[PDB]
Amino acid sequence: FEVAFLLIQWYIYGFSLSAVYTCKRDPCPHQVDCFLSRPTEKTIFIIFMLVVSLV
Amino acid sequence: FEVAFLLIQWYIYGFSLSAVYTCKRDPCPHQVDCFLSRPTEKTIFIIFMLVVSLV
Numbered sequence: 001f002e003v004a005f006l007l008i009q010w011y012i013y014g015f016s017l018s019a020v021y022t023c024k025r026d027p028c029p030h031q032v033d034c035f036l037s038r039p040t041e042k043t044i045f046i047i048f049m050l051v052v053s054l055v
Numbered sequence: 056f057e058v059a060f061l062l063i064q065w066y067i068y069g070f071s072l073s074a075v076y077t078c079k080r081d082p083c084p085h086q087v088d089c090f091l092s093r094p095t096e097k098t099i100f101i102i103f104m105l106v107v108s109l110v
């Protein structure tokens with residue numbers, strides 16, 4: 001289960017977050033720029049949890 | 056002068072107007088859709104003036 005969850009997380013998200021996201025889904029016209037909340041703290045916590053899982 | 060003005064108008068605009076315009080100039084992000092005012096009456100008047108100039 002540990003390995004499966006780690007692989008799924010790696011495939012879907014990764015281990016980092018960026019502040020700006022580009023969206024190309026309807027009904028948005030041709031493109032849209034969107035902005036996230038607290039994109040730096042969450043990376044730190046993600047890394048912490050990754051280390052715990054590996055241990 | 057008549058011929059020169061007709062050629063310039065043909066090169067720059069044409070002889071019609073569309074209701075939706077696509078803009079890709081900064082600072083607009085990646086693209087923008089814009090909408091015009093009275094895009095059908097102006098075509099009629101443009102055609103009238105073209106006919107007058109040719110006559």
Ligand SMILES: CCCCCCCCCCCCCC
Nearest residue numbers: 001002003004005008011012
């Ligand atoms: C341990 C339980 C994990 C559940 C696995 C079921 C498959 C998860 C989705 C796989 C990715 C889907 C991409 C479209």
Ligand SMILES: CCCCCCCCCCCCCC
Nearest residue numbers: 015016017043047050051054
């Ligand atoms: C700029 C942010 C870079 C983050 C990339 C992911 C780094 C993962 C670090 C893993 C180190 C710990 C391994 C045991």
Ligand SMILES: CCCCCCCCCCCCCC
Nearest residue numbers: 040043044045047048051052
């Ligand atoms: C964009 C820069 C992000 C900075 C990442 C620093 C993460 C530090 C995590 C340390 C985890 C240690 C686990 C024992």
Ligand SMILES: CCCCCCCCCCCCCC
Nearest residue numbers: 043044047048051052054055
């Ligand atoms: C500023 C760039 C930071 C690059 C990522 C930092 C996290 C990697 C170190 C992880 C600590 C591991 C402790 C066991």
Ligand SMILES: CCCCCCCCCCCCCC
Nearest residue numbers: 048049050051052053054055
């Ligand atoms: C991030 C990966 C951590 C791996 C180290 C985990 C501790 C293993 C200790 C090895 C010594 C075994 C003594 C019983």
Ligand SMILES: CCCCCCCCCCCCCC
Nearest residue numbers: 056057058059060063066067
């Ligand atoms: C009869 C007076 C007409 C003036 C002609 C001067 C040139 C007009 C501009 C030509 C097109 C410029 C495209 C960058």
Ligand SMILES: CCCCCCCCCCCCCC
Nearest residue numbers: 070071072098102105106109
């Ligand atoms: C759907 C709008 C079509 C407009 C295209 C321009 C047509 C020009 C008509 C010229 C006819 C008169 C020539 C003497």
Ligand SMILES: CCCCCCCCCCCCCC
Nearest residue numbers: 095098099100102103106107
């Ligand atoms: C998109 C459809 C626009 C309809 C264009 C009709 C223009 C009629 C102009 C007639 C001019 C006659 C000059 C004598």
Ligand SMILES: CCCCCCCCCCCCCC
Nearest residue numbers: 098099102103105106107109
């Ligand atoms: C509905 C489509 C209309 C196509 C353009 C109509 C304008 C062309 C006729 C111009 C009249 C010329 C009179 C001398």
Ligand SMILES: CCCCCCCCCCCCCC
Nearest residue numbers: 103104105106107108109110
């Ligand atoms: C749209 C172009 C109009 C061209 C016709 C202009 C009238 C020319 C009449 C030709 C007969 C000459 C008799 C002197």
